[PDB]
């Protein structure tokens, strides 16, 4: 384990982002059980969404791995929970930390795309039938995020 | 293919034409680096540390800036326990030049992925740190309506991201080390100052000249 | 060395399963692509030549427990087969009699498991065994 990883865990626990619980697994210090409350005023309000974070072999050279455990209707999230986000592939610098990724995901939930639209079936639905999309997300928050 | 290569001859560029003839009458030796988009930071990083094995004056002057560099970025808003490990790698290379080491012993440490990349990161951080300090100045040198901070989050800080004049001007003025770039298509960065580091730019590559 | 979690491993397995390995005589993929739990997988083995299995498509089901890949998956044939280690009623694969499941390392993948079964069909005590009629399930 790098000093980077042990210090990041301690700072992440020392100063929590409001609306995000993130406990490392005692068995695998590279794995993090992340829970996010659906931002107030969003289509996800009242829902609680499970995510998982993994710090790969290469960390902090390679970006962290993040995925939704909870089913969610969102442009940046796919049918298996894989998050399309710049700072998780192309635009990740070794200088960036976990809590950046973490609340970056939270910002996504707060106000779903597009500032530059990504091309998928969900995002296309938001780009035209937005009011319909928001009601879909509200419904999916009910049956997946609310127990 | 190595990360940083041997001190190869300048006649090897005819294997890849009258523009090299002009380059020969002012240069004699080339040093190749892996064309992985991290060229500039690895090339300058070796060019300047290799030149410091002859120059004790610039060595201790360089060490003073580099040490003070860490606290500079922290005063600028970089979380300290982030850059600590890349600074520790950077200072450990300055300490390895201070202790008189061979050019071949230095090269073997630059071809170590971990040690080399960790340095490239800190050189990128140094570039990105200085661009954000002189944010007001560089604002209109960026295209696409990208802000200086955004340009830094997208083209400067992340690995495997190509360098142009904005990166070169930036790192040069941060460490106060002049650079001259020769374009396989001459420019001094910054303007007027005597060049310490000679480089050759081909589309996608940066090379150390001598 | 460094432990990789269940889900981040299984997504890689899926990716490789989508791109396809070798020729295609072994392939896998999720039973349901909207299943966020990543538990049920569909395996597919083309029988190895010069054996009584040759040129038969064998569909399998593979299940990954909450502890994969620290402990092996449970594997089961859908297509009927006559093979040492495979139950005649269910098509379940006995974990003891398969050298990859009995001697399970965490580095093994659903790929490795499917090839290991395809290799054991070439074994001397299997290659000549009389087979059931083709295209028949349990």
Curated annotation (Swiss-Prot), chain A:
Residues 1-146 form the UBC core domain. Its EC number is 2.3.2.23. It comes from the Eukaryota. It is found in: Nucleus; Cytoplasm. One of its GO terms (biological process) is T cell receptor signaling pathway. The active site is at 84 (glycyl thioester intermediate). Changing residue 89 to R: No ISGylation. InterPro entries: UBQ-conjugat_E2_core, UBQ-conjugating_AS, UBQ-conjugating_enzyme/RWD. Activity is inhibited by binding to OTUB1, which prevents 'Lys-63'-linked polyubiquitination. Activity is inhibited by GPS2, leading to prevent 'Lys-63'-linked polyubiquitination. GO terms for molecular function: ATP binding; RNA binding; ubiquitin binding; ubiquitin conjugating enzyme activity; ubiquitin protein ligase binding; ubiquitin-protein transferase activator activity; ubiquitin-protein transferase activity. The keyword ATP-binding applies. The keyword Acyltransferase does not apply. Keywords: Acetylation, ATP-binding, Cytoplasm, Disulfide bond, DNA damage, DNA repair, Isopeptide bond, Nucleotide-binding, Nucleus, Transferase, Ubl conjugation, Ubl conjugation pathway. Pathway: Protein modification; protein ubiquitination. Conjugation to ISG15 impairs formation of the thioester bond with ubiquitin but not interaction with UBE2V2. GO terms for cellular component: cytoplasm; cytosol; extracellular exosome; nucleoplasm; nucleus; protein-containing complex; UBC13-MMS2 complex; ubiquitin conjugating enzyme complex. Belongs to the ubiquitin-conjugating enzyme family. This is Ubiquitin-conjugating enzyme E2 N.
Curated annotation (Swiss-Prot), chain B:
Its EC number is 3.4.19.12. GO terms for cellular component: cytosol; extracellular exosome; nucleoplasm. Interacts with FUS and RACK1. Interacts with UBE2D1/UBCH5A, UBE2W/UBC16 and UBE2N/UBC13. Distinct binding sites for the ubiquitins may allow to discriminate among different isopeptide linkages (i.e. 'Lys-48'-, 'Lys-63'-linked polyubiquitin) in polyubiquitin substrates and achieve linkage-specific deubiquitination. It comes from Homo sapiens (Human). It comes from the Eukaryota. The active site is at 36, 39 (nucleophile), 205. This is Ubiquitin thioesterase OTUB1. Isoform 1 is ubiquitous. Isoform 2 is expressed only in lymphoid tissues such as tonsils, lymph nodes and spleen, as well as peripheral blood mononuclear cells. It is an enzyme of class 3 (hydrolase). Residues 28-210 form the OTU domain. It is found in: Cytoplasm. The chain holds residues 45 to 270 of 271 of the full protein. Belongs to the peptidase C65 family. Residues 137-143, 162-169, 186-191 are annotated as: Free ubiquitin binding. It catalyses: Thiol-dependent hydrolysis of ester, thioester, amide, peptide and isopeptide bonds formed by the C-terminal Gly of ubiquitin (a 76-residue protein attached to proteins as an intracellular targeting signal). Coiled coil: none annotated. Changing residue 39 to S: Abolishes hydrolase activity in vitro. Does not affect ability to inhibit RNF168. Does not affect ability to deubiquitinate DEPTOR. Abolishes ability to inhibit RNF168. In the structure described by PubMed:18954305, the His-205 active site of the catalytic triad is located too far to interact directly with the active site Cys-39. A possible explanation is that OTUB1 is in inactive conformation in absence of ubiquitin and a conformation change may move His-205 in the proximity of Cys-39 in presence of ubiquitin substrate. Changing residue 201 to H: Impairs inhibition of UBE2N/UBC13. One of its GO terms (molecular function) is ubiquitin binding. Keywords: Acetylation, Adaptive immunity, Cytoplasm, DNA damage, DNA repair, Hydrolase, Immunity, Phosphoprotein, Protease, Thiol protease, Ubl conjugation pathway. One of its GO terms (biological process) is DNA repair.
From Swiss-Prot, chain C:
Detected in placenta, colon, liver and skin. Detected at very low levels in most tissues. The keyword Transmembrane helix does not apply. Residues 5-138 form the UBC core domain. Induction: Up-regulated in cultured fresh blood cells upon treatment with vitamin D3. InterPro entries: UBQ-conjugat_E2_core, UBQ-conjugating_enzyme/RWD. Keywords: Acetylation, Ubl conjugation pathway. The keyword Secreted does not apply. Pfam families: UQ_con (PF00179). Signal peptide: none annotated. One of its GO terms (cellular component) is nucleoplasm. Disulfide bonds: none annotated. GO terms for biological process: DNA double-strand break processing; error-free postreplication DNA repair; positive regulation of double-strand break repair; positive regulation of protein K63-linked ubiquitination; postreplication repair; protein K63-linked ubiquitination; protein polyubiquitination; protein ubiquitination. Has no ubiquitin ligase activity on its own. The UBE2V2/UBE2N heterodimer catalyzes the synthesis of non-canonical poly-ubiquitin chains that are linked through 'Lys-63'. This type of poly-ubiquitination does not lead to protein degradation by the proteasome. Mediates transcriptional activation of target genes. Plays a role in the control of progress through the cell cycle and differentiation. Plays a role in the error-free DNA repair pathway and contributes to the survival of cells after DNA damage. Belongs to the ubiquitin-conjugating enzyme family. Heterodimer with UBE2N. Binds CHFR. This is Ubiquitin-conjugating enzyme E2 variant 2. The gene is UBE2V2.
